[PDB]
RNA sequence: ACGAGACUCUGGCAUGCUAACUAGUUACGCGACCCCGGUCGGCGUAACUUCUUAGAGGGACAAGUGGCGUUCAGCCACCCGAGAUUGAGCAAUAACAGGUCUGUGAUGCCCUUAGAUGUCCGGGGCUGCACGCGCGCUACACUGACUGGCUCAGCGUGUGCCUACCCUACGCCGGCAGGCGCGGGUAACCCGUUGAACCCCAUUCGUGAUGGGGAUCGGGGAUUGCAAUUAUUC
């Protein structure tokens, strides 16, 4: 029917994860491979918080094709969390009302604020005279 | 299979060199001089010898089947770049020594360097670092 | 550690002693006023100067200021 | 129906190793039994047909991104050159062990050359690769 | 007919004002215009010692060159652009016209 | 210092001390049965793979670094 | 005789074949970007070639 | 399940917090539920942002120790997740309850300090800091040069700490520190 | 009056503005493959700026409330919020016998100036080793080593006025170092979608100076250079 297109971007430490939604059926897959088929597979329950704290019925009318690039291993895993949780918010704003959308934001606000508000932490610059951002070289007396 | 069999071995005194029987075959052979780890796996590959067993199940007549490859790897299609003595100075015999010739050939290249008054060999006489190491700050234990 | 200096305070009194009717109470209101009645060179100072004006307005409505 | 992308990759690289068991006609080289994978390694691998394992990983890598040549194969199959006394550097794989796989899969038609160079997967090789992608998924359901 | 003009400079105010003034001469003749593409900037990096000899505490430098480039396409002949490339040019901007 | 002379391969009593006594423990891992029965860690794992085909231990978590075993279900 | 034993070394490589253009010494040379200038001659003339200590 | 949470397969509910002195510093229930013992971070910036952290994540945050294993949270969660079953296959009960009796019983009440030493009381947040710490370095030597893996030593000690059986490192160092404080008290 | 502040560059938020066939996406249309749907850095197209990039702007002020404070300067707390202190640069008055005449065609003064402390060519040394000291690196293992598999980046540089000397894909030859033939990149183009490690998964080892450690040292092979022996590296 009508083209219900939502493409929500969400950053991470460096990682860029962009979605693209449509009125589909219950399939969620990132870069073509599904979300449980992402290694490391110890973080498998970290990609089901939008699936579990909302329920599967929120994705009965939603398909999402996620393009991700950049970052690290864990940085990608956290980028692909806040990029699809935010995506279903805008799909439940442009097309359905916000009273059915605030009922899935108030659940999202009591667990973790990273899913909707990204981290403003960025790695500080290493200065001269030290191996790290704050660490200086070992001083020798005498 | 699982329990200690009969004809068990703890020590394989082969090529007058003691080989422990507790380890895996491909890693027990490192006791012999002239064989480390990489040369050890491939010689076990040049015959169909099982290596997921220990050094205490392998039968007797085929540990000699190991040996026929050991001193002569040439006729069992092992290349020259595996050898510890490639292109020998006198005859050009691409050979492999195993705990007999190694120290025996070792007191020859000393005098092939010492008689000829070579700068490389003179450091072996004194016992200093020969490969061009900074000697001012390192190597203190051996020299007092 | 947020203590204003003279140029935040000597200027903000010139905003009050000459432009009283042209301001209100809300910050962003007289922030948008002070840009046109005063040439402040930077943006961060533009938020700085007007920020002291609203705080002193919270005093003038409540009492006399020296 | 499902493709290779619906399958966990850990139990895929031995699945394609199983399809070459019924083949036995890849003209496997001679020095495979006494060779190290790369200069950053120092041993040989553990499985006897590791050449049936590393070749089994190339076709799925050529599924994801094609036109890859001999220099693009050594980077992915390389590893950390643990230099020991020095801090480490990264090291690519051996050039020949990649060149003998893309020559093994030119013996049997499973890979073609891309225009302006490269090595990419063929459609009839994508026919039967989507058959071993079913034998893994139908077994775990 | 598809001509490309490069706009590259150092000072941001020197390149931003001349890109728009060259747009102003383009709409007057009302021709096939393209907009300004802003490619990522190149920054030359030099960090060196402050001291001439090797005495004192160790302090370094932060020399920078944030150079910027803009390209503009036109479906215009080489004649009418030569009436625009003769006006409104500041010497800090480097222009190389690509005929084809 | 002190030698932990582990058994490289079983005896006829030690393996017989495995077919009945290991299914009595509540915790079976290659790090304790090798220490409780003085065998190598290689022999420890290779003492339980047959028990899978013997069905005298139950697997609940196999991993790269950690595999644990127990009794069977009590019934 | 003479002329074949004064510059007869190969002078196409090495640090005896490169030098500064301003300081004319062979230490601390900035051979980056075709600068070819010593690092102390770089400091005083950093404004003349155009550099700015922006950071 | 948007109503209840399963820690992998471990239930969120039925953990009674015994001590009332630490229950305001154990964030373990109904407001602090996570499927993983891993968040993005952010807990270590403010003064008292360390009080509402999930305790199982706190132990992993303290486990990545001694150089080579710093910055490797990907595998210490692979240690405690394996170690949680080890507690269950020895007890049969909730393994997280064993941790509750572990941090309760391994936190010293009084502690001498440089003032001549004056033995003084400690904060509950100091107490949960030390109780989680003394076990975390105790198992660090139990797997050191030993066939017993780090997964078991992490699981073995809090089992021995929930009963206070005094064969763990954390119990011994708690009562000696309470006694050497009892000297100059 | 200076310094502090302010100021600058960067870090974070703006589905608003401006536009991108050397940036990406969205579709549509085939090709391939599985049972309409599924996938593809396979291939073209018109709409877009979400991601690409950087231009303008906008955004935070102790602003609002609640305590606290002369109720002044201010401080503590809450909420809304992408931010309720990003990081650096710049940095005074006066001072040191701090250091550099080995950065100079910056130099006073002094020595030397043809059998030259000037200049170049050969070779050696600056690496030399009873000993003490400083910054370091890899380690001392099982949270490990070792072997397969799986999979993630972000900063830069590249054909030189001299300069005869570049970054590199691809195709073969060889276990490797390396070698040969074509093509592109003066660069958001080619390298490069920069397939980095750590990692993750699964083997193997099993508390043993062991498969931890790689110091020492012998033998063979290639690159750079006119030249590597005092082992240039590999």
Pairing of strands A27-30, A62-69: parallel
The number of domains in chain H is 1
Here the tokens at position C45 are 């100072």
* Residue H83 burial class via C-beta count within 10 angstroms: exposed 0-12, middle 13-18, buried 19 and up: buried
For residue E12, list chain G residues with Cβ-Cβ distance below 8 A. none
Instruction: Give yes or no for a contact between A92 and A84, defined as CB atoms under 8 angstroms apart.
Output: no
Q: Cα–Cα distance between D20 and D132 in angstroms, integer?
A: 12
Please note each residue after which chain H is broken, C-to-N distance over 2.5 A, or write none. Answer: 115
Helices D123-137, D51-64: inter-axial angle, 10-degree rounding: 110
Q: What 3 state SS string does D39-102 have?
A: CCCCCCCCCCCCHHHHHHHHHHHHHHCCCCCHHHHHHHCCEEECCCCCCCEEECCCHHHHHCHH
Query: Which residues form the domain of G47?
Result: 1-55
**Residue C47 half-sphere exposure toward CB, CA atoms < 13 A:** 2
Helices H55-63, H73-91: inter-axial angle, 10-degree rounding: 120
Helices H169-183, H150-162: inter-axial angle, 10-degree rounding: 50
Q: Cα–Cα distance between F41 and F30 in angstroms, integer?
A: 6
Instruction: Give yes or no for a contact between A83 and A8, defined as CB atoms under 8 angstroms apart.
Output: yes
Instruction: Give yes or no for a contact between H26 and H100, defined as CB atoms under 8 angstroms apart.
Output: yes
Here the tokens at position E67 are 């150079």
β-bridge partners, D80: D90
Cα–Cα distances in Å, from F62 out to A138, F59, H82, H84?
45, 7, 9, 14
Residue E18 has a CB neighbour count (10 Å cut-off) of 19
Query: Which residues form the domain of H103?
Result: 1-185
For residue B82, list chain D residues with Cβ-Cβ distance below 8 A. 34
Which chains form contacts with chain B, at 3 or more CB pairs under 8 Å?
A: D, F
Here the tokens at position E17 are 């004002």
Q: Cα–Cα distance between B2 and F47 in angstroms, integer?
A: 8
Q: Cα–Cα distance between A35 and A76 in angstroms, integer?
A: 12
The number of domains in chain G is 1
**Nucleotides of I strand lying within 7 Å of any protein CB atom:** 4-13, 15, 18-20, 22, 25-27, 32-35, 37-42, 50-56, 58-64, 71-75, 82-83, 85-90, 98-100, 102-104, 120-122, 127-138, 141-158, 160-165, 168-179, 183, 188, 192-193, 195-211, 213-221, 225-227, 229-233
End-to-end CA distance of chain A: 81
**Closest-CA residue in chain B for F13?**
B3
Interface residues on E facing A, Cβ-Cβ cutoff 8 A: 47, 57-60
Here the tokens at position D52 are 């049936």
Q: Residue H107 contacts by C-beta under 8 Å, 6 or more apart in sequence?
A: H22, H122, H127, H128, H130, H131, H174
**Closest-CA residue in chain A for D8?**
A37
**Closest-CA residue in chain F for H81?**
F61
**Closest-CA residue in chain E for A137?**
E58
What is the nearest nucleotide to D97, using C1' and CA? I175
Provide the CATH number for the domain around residue G41. 4.10.830.10
Which chains form contacts with chain C, at 3 or more CB pairs under 8 Å?
A: none
Counting every residue written for chain G, the total comes to: 55
Residue A95 has a CB neighbour count (10 Å cut-off) of 14
The DSSP code sequence of chain H is --S--EETTEESS------TTTGGG-B-SSSS--SSS-----TTSSTTTTSSSBHHHHHHHHHS-TGGGTT-HHHHHHHHHHHHHHHHHHHSS-HHHHHHHHHHHTS-SEE--B--B--EE--HHHHHHHHHHHHHHHHHHHSTTSSS-HHHHHHHHHHHHHTT-S-SHHHHHHHHHHHHHHHT-
Phi-psi region of H112 (alpha: psi -120 to 50; beta: other; left: phi over 0): beta
Q: Cα–Cα distance between D97 and D28 in angstroms, integer?
A: 11
DSSP H stretches of helix in F1-56: 33-36, 41-45, 49-54
Nominal resolution in Å? 3.7
What is the nearest nucleotide to B97, using C1' and CA? I219
Here the tokens at position H118 are 């004056």
Closest partner residue to A46 among H2, H35, H41, by Cβ? H35
The DSSP code sequence of E30-92 is T--B---EEPPPEEEEE--BSSSSS-SS--B--EEEEEEEEEEEE---HHHHTTTTTSS--TT
Task: Name the minimum distance, in Å, from the CA of A44 to any CA of chain H.
Answer: 9
Here the tokens at position A116 are 């909707």
Q: What are phi and psi of H4, to 5 degrees?
A: -115, 165
3-state class (DSSP) for residue E9: strand
3-state class (DSSP) for residue D112: strand
Q: Residue D55 contacts by C-beta under 8 Å, 6 or more apart in sequence?
A: D20, D26, D101, D104, D105
Measure, in angstroms, how far nucleotide I177 C1' is from residue D8 CA. 37
Q: Cα–Cα distance between H174 and E5 in angstroms, integer?
A: 77
Contacts 24+ apart (CB under 8 A), B13-21: B14/B63, B14/B67, B15/B67, B15/B70, B15/B71, B15/B98, B15/B99, B15/B100, B16/B99, B16/B100, B17/B98, B17/B99, B17/B100, B19/B55, B20/B55, B21/B54, B21/B55, B21/B56
Q: Residue G26 contacts by C-beta under 8 Å, 6 or more apart in sequence?
A: G15, G16, G18, G19, G20
Which candidate in A28, A30, A33, A34 is best for mutational testing of the D interface (most D CBs within 10 A)? A33
- CA atoms H13, H19, H21, H22: torsion sign: negative
Residue B18 has a CB neighbour count (10 Å cut-off) of 12
Instruction: Give yes or no for a contact between B63 and B13, defined as CB atoms under 8 angstroms apart.
Output: no
Element (H, E) at A21: strand A21-23
3-state class (DSSP) for residue G47: helix
Element (H, E) at E97: strand E97-98
Residue nearest to nucleotide I174 (CA to C1'): D96
For residue E50, list chain G residues with Cβ-Cβ distance below 8 A. 43
Please note each residue after which chain C is broken, C-to-N distance over 2.5 A, or write none. Answer: none
Which chains form contacts with chain F, at 3 or more CB pairs under 8 Å?
A: B, H
Q: Residue E82 contacts by C-beta under 8 Å, 6 or more apart in sequence?
A: none
Q: Cα–Cα distance between A80 and A68 in angstroms, integer?
A: 8
Here the tokens at position H175 are 């009562």
Q: Cα–Cα distance between B103 and B98 in angstroms, integer?
A: 9
What is the nearest nucleotide to D119, using C1' and CA? I170
- CA atoms E78, E80, E83, E88: torsion sign: negative
Q: Cα–Cα distance between D32 and E47 in angstroms, integer?
A: 50
* Residue A62 burial class via C-beta count within 10 angstroms: exposed 0-12, middle 13-18, buried 19 and up: buried
């Amino acid at each position: 029917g009508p083209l219900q297109s939502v493409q929500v971007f969400g950053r991470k430490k460096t990682a860029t994860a962009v979605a693209h939604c449509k009125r589909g059926n219950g399939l969620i897959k990132v870069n073509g491979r599904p979300l449980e088929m992402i290694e490391p597979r110890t973080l498998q329950y970290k990609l089901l918080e939008p699936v579990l704290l909302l329920g599967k019925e929120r994705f009965a009318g939603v398909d999402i094709r996620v393009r991700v690039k950049g970052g690290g291993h864990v940085a990608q895993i956290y980028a692909i969390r806040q990029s699809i949780s935010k995506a279903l918010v805008a799909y439940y704003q442009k097309y359905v009302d916000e009273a059915s959308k605030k009922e899935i934001k108030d659940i999202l606000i009591q667990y973790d604020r990273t899913l909707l508000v990204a981290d403003p932490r960025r790695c500080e610059s290493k200065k001269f005279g030290g191996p790290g951002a704050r660490a200086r070289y070992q001083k020798s007396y005498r | 299979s699982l329990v200690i069999p009969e004809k068990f071995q703890h020590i394989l005194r082969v090529l007058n060199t003691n080989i422990d029987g507790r380890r895996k075959i491909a890693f027990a052979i490192t006791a012999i001089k002239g064989v480390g780890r990489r040369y050890a796996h491939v010689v076990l590959r040049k015959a169909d010898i099982d290596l997921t067993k220990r050094a205490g199940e392998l039968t007797e007549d085929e540990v000699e089947r190991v040996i026929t490859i050991m001193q002569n790897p040439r006729q069992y299609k092992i290349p020259d770049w595996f050898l510890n003595r490639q292109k020998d100075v006198k005859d050009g015999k691409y050979s492999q020594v195993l705990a007999n010739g190694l120290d025996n050939k070792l007191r020859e290249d000393l005098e092939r360097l010492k008689k000829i008054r070579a700068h490389r060999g003179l450091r072996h006489f004194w016992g200093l670092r020969v490969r061009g190491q900074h000697t001012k700050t390192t190597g203190r234990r051996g020299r007092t | 550690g947020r203590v204003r200096t003279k140029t935040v305070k000597k200027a903000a009194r010139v905003i009050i002693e000459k432009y009283y009717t042209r301001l209100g109470n809300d910050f962003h209101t007289n922030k948008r006023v002070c840009e046109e009645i005063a040439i402040i060179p930077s943006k961060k100072l533009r938020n700085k100067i007007a920020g002291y004006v609203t705080h002193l307005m919270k005093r003038i409505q409540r009492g006399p200021v020296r | 129906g499902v493709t290779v992308k619906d399958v966990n990759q850990q139990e895929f690289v031995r699945a394609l190793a199983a399809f070459l068991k019924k083949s036995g006609k890849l003209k496997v080289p001679e020095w495979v039994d006494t060779v190290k994978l790369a200069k950053h390694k120092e041993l040989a691998p553990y499985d006897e047909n590791w050449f049936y394992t590393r070749a089994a990983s190339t076709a799925r890598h050529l599924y994801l991104r094609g036109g890859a040549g001999v220099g693009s194969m050594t980077k992915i199959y390389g590893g950390r050159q643990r230099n020991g006394v020095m801090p480490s550097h990264f090291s690519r794989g051996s050039k020949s062990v990649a060149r003998r796989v893309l020559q093994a899969l030119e013996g049997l038609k499973m890979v073609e050359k891309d225009q302006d160079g490269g090595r990419k997967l063929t459609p009839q090789g994508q026919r039967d690769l989507d058959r071993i992608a079913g034998q893994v998924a139908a077994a775990k359901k | 007919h598809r001509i490309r003009i490069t706009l590259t400079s150092r000072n941001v105010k020197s390149l931003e004002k001349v890109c728009a003034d060259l747009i102003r001469g383009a709409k007057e003749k009302n021709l096939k215009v393209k907009g300004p593409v802003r490619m990522p900037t190149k920054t030359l990096r030099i960090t060196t010692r402050k001291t001439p000899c090797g005495e004192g505490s160790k302090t370094w430098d932060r020399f920078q060159m944030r150079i910027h480039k803009r390209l503009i396409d036109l479906h215009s002949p080489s004649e009418i652009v030569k009436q625009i490339t003769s006006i409104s040019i500041e010497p800090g901007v480097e222009v190389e016209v690509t005929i084809a | 210092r002190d030698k932990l002379n582990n058994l490289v391969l079983f005896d006829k009593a030690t393996y017989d001390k495995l077919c009945k006594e290991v299914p009595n423990y509540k915790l079976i891992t290659p790090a304790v049965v090798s220490e409780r029965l003085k065998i190598r860690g290689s022999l420890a794992r290779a003492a339980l793979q047959e028990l899978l085909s013997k069905g005298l231990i139950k697997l609940v978590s196999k991993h790269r670094a950690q595999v644990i075993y127990t009794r069977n279900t009590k019934g | 005789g003479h002329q074949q034993l004064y510059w007869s070394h190969p002078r196409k490589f090495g640090q005896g074949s490169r030098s500064c253009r301003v300081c004319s010494n062979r230490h601390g040379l900035i051979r980056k970007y075709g600068l070819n200038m010593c690092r102390q001659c770089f400091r005083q003339y950093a404004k003349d070639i155009g550099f700015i200590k922006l950071d | 399940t948007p109503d209840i949470k399963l820690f992998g397969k471990w239930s969120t509910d039925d953990v009674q917090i015994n001590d009332i002195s630490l229950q305001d510093y154990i964030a373990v229930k109904e407001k602090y539920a996570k499927y993983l013992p891993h968040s993005a971070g952010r807990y270590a910036a403010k003064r008292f942002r360390k009080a509402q952290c999930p305790i199982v994540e706190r132990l992993t945050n303290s486990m990545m120790m001694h150089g080579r294993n710093n910055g490797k949270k990907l595998m210490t969660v692979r240690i405690v997740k394996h170690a949680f079953e080890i507690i269950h296959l020895l007890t049969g009960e909730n393994p997280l309850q064993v941790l509750v009796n572990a941090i309760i019983n391994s936190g010293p009440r009084e502690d001498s300090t440089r003032i001549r030493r004056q033995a003084v009381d400690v904060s509950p947040l100091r107490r949960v800091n030390q109780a989680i710490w003394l076990l975390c370095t105790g198992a660090r030597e139990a797997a050191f040069r030993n066939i017993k893996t780090i997964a078991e030593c992490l699981a073995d000690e809090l089992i021995n700490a929930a009963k206070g059986s005094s064969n763990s490192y954390a119990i011994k160092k708690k009562d000696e520190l309470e006694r050497v404080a009892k000297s100059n008290r």
